[PDB]
């Protein structure tokens, strides 16, 4: 479910599906009780799809459009924690690297939809 | 020389005929029992 | 030069709340037929736990200030209001009178009404009024009654994560209570959670693995409670040595005769086992507060009678325990109960929960694993330190179960910089 | 159950005052607290107190209030009173869910 | 740190409802109980009501169970006060306060009060 | 619902915004809120279902996901010839839309007829 | 009766059809109650039922989406791969498999190897994604 | 050349998934309240997505189906879900003193009147329902079993009831007229939801039953075998008319309201049922010669009533009104063949399903009860055997899901793997 999730950078981005897959899983008064229930659980199931289907749909926007090892054309920048590429991919966990990169996600956001529409307009 | 392009997500509607169901608010006068409460 | 690739399958989390779903064990079906406390039409899903140990990895959990207590605890509110909630209402001047047979003082009084009659009520359901004897709560709070064939009792009731969460769990044996866990690991669904809706006292709880287990926020401050967890746990054994009739449009309960001698339920604890735990949880204490200082364990300060007793449920029943006597030592068997129908259960005003009287002994045996300590003031640098039992609020008592859990959101979605390029 | 309690005292500046809170007869054990309300600000509150003086502390308040028991009787002593003392001060309990307050001891202090 | 700030009428006139709207910053997440109180001039005061954050599950003086409403906002951090049907002797000093969460042996307090709003009721 | 604020703007603006983008058993009216829940979650289950009809729709006219995406169909004279500066400066998404309601289904087809070539022409070499 | 069942109705509409001409209809196919008495609370219950089984075809729909793009796929409906097909997987030609048996024959030859396959797609995926 | 996918494609697998019920709406919203046959099941779509498909032949097997099955078990829960609420006759098992009844003689009339001294009260039996104990008599189980009585508002009657797969499956539908059901289906259509299906329980006769097109249908999974049984489904229904000539009145003893049959109005006479002759005879010539057509025209057909065993399957059991009759018919299979007033009693403590668990007992039914039903399928045993003699088929049955294999006859449920692959000359770029 989590899976290798406190494990090095590379065995988790090498079982990434593990992941992707397992987050898309009468008598009147009785009766209410019953209705109430379903209400509990079917809005579960919906706000997951629907958070996913987000989370796609974010996905979409940039250039991955549901691929999972995306690949986009903005440049790293220095200021974001520049260090060793090899470092960075066999040292730190994933939890660490986006603890520490968490007050960098707006921007970088920003900037791969700004990459990616600006490629759609160019060409 | 324009070309077609498609925009998911902007804000258009249009007019179209439906079956609306009913509100009320008393207790199942009217027949009341196809109509359901209105708290919202 | 690196470039920026984002990944949808990346396991990291961060914590947040949710409206978790309750579960109850499978076998609750054989159970739920009698419409008992055992949960309700609210999801009575099928569990099935499939723990998932993690590894390198520490999560920082903290027990105190954790929603999920809170969320269980009105969960636990809205299943006991929806039990009582079809049951018949009271609303009801009672002329009493000192009536006993064998007893021994006599806290029975026979209140006696017109309707177009008898019965036996107790001294903590009544006050003098000006003999005339009217129950607490009259004109103030709706006293309602239970409907006697809902048998309210103790059940397991997990709580499985929703679709896109995940519980956390701290398989570290000796928890601090607080701070990093080095052993997590996430679960399906939790344990088998059980409501002990029991005050000063825990009743069939959770037992450690190592030495009693001492955990709060300060053991510092003595305004923040001291939750205490076993390891020999102690039976408490008593019965209802007492019968009583149903009276009856007027849909009115009540009690009736009694048959056999009358006397209250002394209740029995082994001695040497209390001694055993209580000295363990003054070596505990020792650790947290110096090798040297004097330890006391007076009785409850005062109060509603719900903080100074010791209350649980016993088989459709509540008894209240005078607990002076297991709380009393310093440090360098029997205790007395009570018995009473209107329950302001919940501190909550308007709900009384009058109890139908039970037919018959129960004996249930229940076996305690936490305690509950407030410390005493601090004028004394170093004398002493008293540590009175207390409390009352039950989120304390549920704390003691969901110590070792976190709900996280999974956050799959994330950015990293590789050497590849579009 | 009523939190019978003087309704006024004083004293010179930079003594000592002992101000009193009475339980009723049915609150003979019960733990009460203790509030500040000075001309103007929020009421702080300042510390609790059960039936034997053990009393808890809070942050950003004087050491010099105290706290103490006897019996039916709650006395709450200050020393060395200074202007900002100006204020009045009222006990508080917790029977059932409902709350009982006093009637508030009006301080004052003497220039 | 918890801060409580309130506002609402200064004069109402007798024989309607009064709305009072009491702000928190600094508040716990969840898990709060936020009470409304009053103090009648020249004379204790007494207890008007709470709020469960959490739970939406409302409690009121006995003697005012009818008159007394009480709602929450989470979104904005609010929590509103109704008093339906104010007469002449309603006229009060009120106070919005958080009740802890420990219960020392018996005893809620109101650790965190609001500044206090006079409300006078008068033609 | 809810993506209707930005309505009766310029398509400038319409396009920028759309580009950056425990309950008790003892509430009162009891009936009412669980009615009217199931009546929410009817409309959150039908707006997945028409977002996924529309992204199928979005697909076979090869573009998958995204929201500007871009074709390869020239603009016909017939469909409405304006100045484009007056056409996506003044007047607002709606207006358009009714201008433009006649020829969509024309649109569509062409749309399709032209992905379709591209996918022929392009898995040719 | 509406949702997704339908479209999954929809892809049966034609199995004994040939091949090609079922890819190109695959192609083709990719576009108030009187409630007389205590009606209304079952009408509740019901809703609730049906809304769990739309639901469910949602779900499935989107897993089987999601499989599909966990290949080189995203989410059209036809998709070309570039893993190579062994001569193992039937040997024979493919004249006869894309003119002359359905799709059922091929699914009940194909059922034995099917997870092979997959991993196999999935692997050159990942490989051509690495690498480029 | 290269692999390519295909998502949307037709593709079958047979697998095994709950179905969820579904009650007609004119079932429920017309009259029908308190009645076991409905209750919360989603109602039917007001047109089945049936659509009609070509040039494909899908394998059948009824004996291995899994609907029956599926059906038997929720009809079982339904069934104890619907007794549950009722008040138990625990306290009613306890020594009584009978006496028959001699006011009126028909075949006497078999019934005792019991005094039962509950703390002397007087009721009704029937004999097959008390037994004597060494008059004393006593309940058949009320030792060693759990009995119960019905609700008396609640009444036991058909009502269709269709089976609608979930999402991501679908119900084959073998539309075939000549259909002996096993082995391939020229016509295979698909359904989400299937026709009306009414559980009527009854043995060695199909009631209610579903009428087959086309001629007379002999059914089983091998023909050669004792041991399995034969369907036989008839193309014309064949009218049968049983009533019950007595009314009764219902007392009300405490125990917990205990009803008791009262003294009969009247005069006193054991139940019959009546069929046209003309038309069994027909309707066997019809079976004897589909039997023939399986077996040889020299092949000799002979017929016999029941062997024997229990007694809910020697005799034709079957509810009307509220009773619940064993009716025989020992004398509509006595005739042998080379190339009907039916008397009969009931019984108010019976055991449904065949288990030893809890027997519900029959509320009294107050008046005439008289039915109409439509015998349309039979169940037959062959013969043991010695060869090429001739073949005997006394009636067998009882077993409720072979009852259930005659509606479900014609279904199975499939699940729909739209991600084919398939190989072509297409490379990606
Ligand atoms: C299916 O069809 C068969 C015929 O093939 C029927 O079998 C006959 O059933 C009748 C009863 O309906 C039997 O009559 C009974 O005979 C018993 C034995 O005594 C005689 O019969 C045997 C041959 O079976 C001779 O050898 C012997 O010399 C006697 O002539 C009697 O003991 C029976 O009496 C008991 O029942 C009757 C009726 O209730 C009571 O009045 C008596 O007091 C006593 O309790 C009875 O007379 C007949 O013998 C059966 N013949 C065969 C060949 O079995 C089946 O009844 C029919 N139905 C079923 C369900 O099988
Ligand atoms: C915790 O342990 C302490 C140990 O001392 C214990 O204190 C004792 O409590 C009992 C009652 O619980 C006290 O007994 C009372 O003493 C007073 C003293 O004046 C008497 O007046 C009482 O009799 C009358 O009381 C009321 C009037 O005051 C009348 O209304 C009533 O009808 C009686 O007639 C009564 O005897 C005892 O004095 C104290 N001990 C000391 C040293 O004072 C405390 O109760 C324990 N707490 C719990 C919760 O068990
Ligand atoms: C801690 O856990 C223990 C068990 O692990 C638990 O003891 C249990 O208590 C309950 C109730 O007090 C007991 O249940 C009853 O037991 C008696 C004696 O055997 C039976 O006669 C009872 O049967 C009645 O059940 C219904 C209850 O209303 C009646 O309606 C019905 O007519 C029957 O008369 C009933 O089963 C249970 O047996 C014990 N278990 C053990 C092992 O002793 C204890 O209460 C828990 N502590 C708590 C909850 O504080
Ligand atoms: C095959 O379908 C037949 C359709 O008629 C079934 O006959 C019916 O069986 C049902 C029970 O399953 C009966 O329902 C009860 O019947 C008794 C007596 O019937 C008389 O009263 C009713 C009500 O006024 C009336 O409709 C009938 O015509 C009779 O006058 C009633 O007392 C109960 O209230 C309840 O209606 C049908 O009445 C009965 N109809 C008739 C006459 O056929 C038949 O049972 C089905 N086969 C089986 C055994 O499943
Ligand atoms: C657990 O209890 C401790 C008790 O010490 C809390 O520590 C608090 O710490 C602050 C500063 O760190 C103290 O403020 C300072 O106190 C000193 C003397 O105590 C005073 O001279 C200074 O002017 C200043 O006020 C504070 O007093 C102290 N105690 C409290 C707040 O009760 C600690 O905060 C508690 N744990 C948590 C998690 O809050
Ligand atoms: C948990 O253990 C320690 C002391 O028993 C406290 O938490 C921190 O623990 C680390 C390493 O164990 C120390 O370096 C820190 O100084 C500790 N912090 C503090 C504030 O003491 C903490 O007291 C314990 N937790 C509880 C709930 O008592
Ligand atoms: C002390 O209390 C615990 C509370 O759980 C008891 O544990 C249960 O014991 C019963 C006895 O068979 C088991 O069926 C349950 O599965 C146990 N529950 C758990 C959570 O372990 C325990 O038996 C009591 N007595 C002791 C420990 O001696
Ligand atoms: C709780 O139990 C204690 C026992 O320790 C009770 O204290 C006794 O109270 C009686 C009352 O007159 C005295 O005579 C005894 O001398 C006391 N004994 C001790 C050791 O203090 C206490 O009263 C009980 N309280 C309640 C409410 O039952
Ligand atoms: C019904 O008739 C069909 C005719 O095809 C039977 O199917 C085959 O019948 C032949 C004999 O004609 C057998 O040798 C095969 O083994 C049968 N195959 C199947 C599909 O089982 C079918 O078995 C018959 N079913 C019955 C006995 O009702
Ligand atoms: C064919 C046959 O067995 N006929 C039976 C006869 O034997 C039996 O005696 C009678 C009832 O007594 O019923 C008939
Ligand atoms: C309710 O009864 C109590 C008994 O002491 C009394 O004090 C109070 O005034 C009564 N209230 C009303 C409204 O009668
Ligand atoms: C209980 O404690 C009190 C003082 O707190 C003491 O006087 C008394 O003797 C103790 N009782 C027992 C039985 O230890
Ligand atoms: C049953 O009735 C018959 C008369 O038909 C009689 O001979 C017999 O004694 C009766 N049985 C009992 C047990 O009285
Ligand atoms: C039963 O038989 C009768 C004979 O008239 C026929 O009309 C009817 O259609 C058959 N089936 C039903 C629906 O009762």
Not at chain 1, 42 to 59: G, I, N, P, S, T
Not at chain 3, 143 to 167: L, N, R
Not at chain 3, 282 to 293: A, D, I, M, S, Y
Request: a positive charge; glycine letters at 8%.
């Amino acid at each position: 479910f989590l899976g290798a999730a406190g494990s090095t950078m590379g065995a988790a981005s090498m079982t990434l599906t593990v992941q992707a897959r397992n987050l898309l899983s009468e008598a009147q008064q009785h009766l209410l009780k019953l209705t109430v229930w379903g209400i509990k659980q079917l809005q579960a199931r919906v706000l997951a799809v629907e958070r996913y289907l987000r989370d796609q749909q974010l996905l979409g926007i940039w250039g991955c459009s549901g691929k999972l090892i995306c690949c986009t054309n903005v440049p790293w920048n220095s200021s974001w924690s520049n260090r060793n590429l090899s470092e960075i991919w066999d040292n730190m966990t994933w939890l660490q690297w986006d603890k520490e990169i968490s007050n960098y996600t707006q921007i970088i956001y920003g900037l791969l939809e700004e990459s990616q529409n600006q490629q759609e307009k160019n060409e | 020389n324009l070309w077609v392009t498609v925009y998911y997500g902007v804000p258009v509607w249009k007019d179209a005929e439906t079956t609306l169901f009913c509100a009320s608010d008393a207790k199942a006068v009217w027949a009341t029992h196809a109509c359901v409460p209105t708290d919202p | 030069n690196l470039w920026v690739t984002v990944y949808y399958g990346v396991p990291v989390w961060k914590d947040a709340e949710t409206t978790l779903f309750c579960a109850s064990d499978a076998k609750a079906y054989e159970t739920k037929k009698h419409n008992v406390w055992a949960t309700h039409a609210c999801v009575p899903t099928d569990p099935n736990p499939q723990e998932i140990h993690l590894e390198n990895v520490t999560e920082e959990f903290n027990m105190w200030k954790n929603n999920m207590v809170e969320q269980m605890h009105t969960d636990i509110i809205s299943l006991w209001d929806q039990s009582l909630k079809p049951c018949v209402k009271l609303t009801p001047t009672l002329q009493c009178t000192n009536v006993t047979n064998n007893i021994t003082r006599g806290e029975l009084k026979n209140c006696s009404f017109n309707m177009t009659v008898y019965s036996l009520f107790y001294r903590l359901d009544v006050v003098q009024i000006n003999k005339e004897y009217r129950l607490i709560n009259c004109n103030t709070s709706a006293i309602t009654q239970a409907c006697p064939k809902v048998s309210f009792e103790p059940i397991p009731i997990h709580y499985c994560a929703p679709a896109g969460f995940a519980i956390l769990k701290c398989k570290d044996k000796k928890f601090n209570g607080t701070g990093p866990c080095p052993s997590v690991s996430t679960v399906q669904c939790t344990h088998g959670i059980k409501p002990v809706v029991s005050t000063q006292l825990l009743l069939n709880g959770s037992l450690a693995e190592e030495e009693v287990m001492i955990r709060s926020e300060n053991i510092t401050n003595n305004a923040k409670n001291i939750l205490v967890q076993f390891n020999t746990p102690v039976q408490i054994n008593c019965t209802r040595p007492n019968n009583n009739t149903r009276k009856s449009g007027q849909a009115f309960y009540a009690t009736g005769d009694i048959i056999g001698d009358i006397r209250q339920a002394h209740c029995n604890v082994s001695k040497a086992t209390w001694n055993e735990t209580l000295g363990k949880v003054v070596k505990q204490l020792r650790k947290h507060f110096g090798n040297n200082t004097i330890i006391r364990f007076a009785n409850s300060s005062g109060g509603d009678l719900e903080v100074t007793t010791h209350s649980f449920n016993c088989g459709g029943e509540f008894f209240y325990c005078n607990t002076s006597g297991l709380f009393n030592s310093t440090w360098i068997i029997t205790l007395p109960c009570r018995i009473k129908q209107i329950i302001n259960m919940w501190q909550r005003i308007g709900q009384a929960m009058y109890a139908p009287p039970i037919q018959g002994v129960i004996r249930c045996v229940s076996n305690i694993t936490g305690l509950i300590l407030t410390r005493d003031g601090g004028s004394t640098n170093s004398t002493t330190e008293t540590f009175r039992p207390g409390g009352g609020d039950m989120r304390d008592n549920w704390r003691s179960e969901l110590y070792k859990y976190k709900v996280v959101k999974i956050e799959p979605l994330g950015v990293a910089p590789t050497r590849c390029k579009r | 159950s009523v939190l019978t309690q003087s309704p006024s005292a004083s004293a010179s500046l930079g003594a000592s005052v002992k101000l009193t809170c009475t339980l009723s007869s049915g609150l003979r054990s019960y733990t009460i607290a203790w509030y500040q309300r000075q001309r103007g600000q929020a009421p702080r509150f300042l510390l609790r107190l059960d039936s034997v003086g053990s009393h808890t502390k809070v942050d950003g308040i004087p050491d010099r209030f105290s706290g103490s028991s006897s019996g039916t009787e709650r006395y709450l002593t200050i020393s060395n009173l200074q202007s900002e003392d100006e204020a009045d001060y009222f006990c508080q309990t917790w029977t059932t869910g409902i709350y009982i307050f006093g009637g508030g001891t009006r301080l004052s202090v003497l220039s | 740190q918890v801060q409580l700030q309130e506002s609402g009428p200064g004069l109402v006139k007798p024989s309607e409802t009064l709305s009072l709207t009491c702000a928190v910053s600094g508040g716990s997440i969840s898990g709060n109980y936020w009470s409304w109180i009053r103090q009648s001039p020249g004379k204790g005061l007494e207890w008007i009501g709470h709020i469960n954050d959490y739970s939406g599950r409302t409690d009121y003086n006995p003697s005012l169970k009818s008159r007394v409403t009480i709602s929450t906002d989470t979104s904005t951090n609010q929590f509103f006060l109704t008093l339906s049907s104010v007469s002449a002797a309603d006229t009060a000093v009120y106070y919005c306060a958080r009740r802890d969460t420990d219960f020392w042996r018996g005893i809620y307090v109101f650790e965190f009060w609001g500044q206090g709003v006079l409300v006078t009721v008068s033609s």
